[PDB]
């Protein structure tokens, strides 16, 4: 219904189109009011060494060799560009991943904004993970942002961590302020 690009990650696309990416952080950030459901037993991981993290949350008290988590990254975008084109690269970062296998995919808008989402399984560390990656390109005032969310879990924990993941993925929200 919308045709996807094949070459070039969303970030790479933006770089090339001249756009410039400033990572944001939550304290002091107010351009955009983003809800990130915190399911029960789940806590903000401080010091997550995830590069440009806005926030990371996780279920540490749960088990498995892999900790169920959600990562949220927010870049302010500097340069004129066209969101709808950008979004069409929304799937590529996920699809490059080793053994990627799609369960769901959509370029429908999210909370009024151009957005990609893709879900599926891939391999990391001789292990199979199940993840959900949404990118959304929000405008507040004269400013534009890339907001990216990943929700990940061992495949064996899908279902069992199910309500935690639904709640984040489906209750996730992004509003201008």
Swiss-Prot record:
Q: Which UniProt keywords apply?
A: Signal
Q: Which domain of life is it from?
A: Bacteria
- UniProt keyword Signal, yes or no: yes
Family per record: To M.leprae ML0031.
* Record-given protein name: Proline-rich 28 kDa antigen
Native organism: Mycobacterium tuberculosis (strain CDC 1551 / Oshkosh)
Question: What are the top taxonomic ranks of the organism?
Answer: Bacteria, Bacillati, Actinomycetota, Actinomycetes, Mycobacteriales
Q: Which residues of the full protein are shown?
A: 97 to 273 of 310
């Amino acid at each position: 219904p919308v045709t996807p690009a094949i070459s070039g990650t969303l970030r790479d696309h933006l770089r090339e189109k001249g756009v410039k990416l400033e990572a944001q952080r939550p304290h002091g950030f107010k351009a955009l009011d983003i809800t990130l459901p915190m399911p029960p037993r789940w806590t903000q991981v401080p010091d997550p060494n995830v590069p440009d993290a806005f926030v990371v949350i996780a279920d540490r008290l749960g088990n498995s060799v892999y900790t169920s988590n959600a990562q949220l990254v927010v870049y302010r975008l500097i340069g004129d560009f066209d969101p709808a084109e950008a979004i069409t690269h929304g799937y590529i970062d996920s699809q490059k991943l080793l053994a990627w296998q799609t369960t769901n995919a959509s370029m429908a808008n999210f909370d009024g904004f151009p957005s990609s989402i893709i879900e599926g399984t891939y391999r990391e560390n001789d292990m199979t993970l199940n993840t959900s990656r949404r990118h959304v390109i929000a405008t507040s005032g004269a400013d534009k942002y890339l907001v990216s969310l990943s929700v990940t879990t061992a495949l064996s924990q899908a279902v069992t961590d199910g309500p935690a993941t639904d709640a984040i993925v489906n209750g996730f929200q992004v509003v201008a302020h």
